[PDB]
Design a protein around this ligand. Structure first.
Ligand code: G64
Ligand code: CL
Ligand code: CL
Ligand code: CL
Ligand code: NA
Ligand code: NA
Ligand code: NA
Lengths: 99, 99
């Protein structure tokens, strides 16, 4: 699809068996999801943006279906104000910015 | 152009006669640049990022070139990890996300 930027680029994702709404975010290096449980090993990480840093749990090798397209990679879990699909997974679904 | 996302989508911008680097950020409604001098009056605005809220100075109707494309619109000035081009200006340059 061609997603307009007149509105926030929100899509439905499936992660950990759960449906969520998330932002397709070219400004995010990594994918960050609100608090949830995920299987397997994790390690702590700090990520920063406007207003400073939050602590997250880093889970590797997690599958996420993004608007119907499956992708595997690292997912960060923590107190983010919005679910964010970052570049690490946008690449895997072939997303590009066009103008 | 067609910009893939294996690297950060950094472009050159021109504002006030000066070249700067900025990140094309579909996850931002608005454009935020690091401290600089802009003409005219400003208004107050709060931005809630991943780490919390910050105060910024809102300047309206500012001339800015983005990757060689001309825009005239709102620029926020305040403390950001990186200059961010948000949707208010991505729409002016005709950007879309595609997959
Ligand atoms: C290492 O991986 C990282 C992943 C993400 C981030 S980040 O979320 O901090 N961020 C990085 C960027 C600042 C360099 C990605 C940005 O796209 C974030 C994503 C994000 C959106 C909303 C809330 C938190 C984070 N946007 C803004 O900072 C940002 C900046 C401006 C100037 C405006 C807005 C904006 O439109 N809103 C705050 C509206 C809003 N509010 C809520 C609650 O949701 C949304 C969509 C967002 C940092 C590290
Ligand atoms: Cl990854
Ligand atoms: Cl590619
Ligand atoms: Cl604007
Ligand atoms: Na894992
Ligand atoms: Na000034
Ligand atoms: Na103005």
């Amino acid at each position: 699809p061609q997603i307009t930027l007149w509105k926030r680029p929100l899509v439905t994702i499936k992660i950990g068996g759960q449906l969520k709404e998330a932002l397709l975010d070219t400004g995010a290096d990594d994918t960050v999801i609100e608090e949830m449980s995920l299987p397997g090993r994790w390690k702590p990480k700090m990520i920063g943006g406007i207003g400073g840093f939050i602590k997250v749990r880093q889970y590797d090798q997690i599958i996420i279906e993004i608007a119907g397209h499956k992708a595997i990679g690292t997912v960060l879990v923590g107190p983010t104000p919005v679910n964010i699909i970052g570049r690490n997974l946008l690449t895997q679904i072939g997303a590009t910015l066009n103008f």
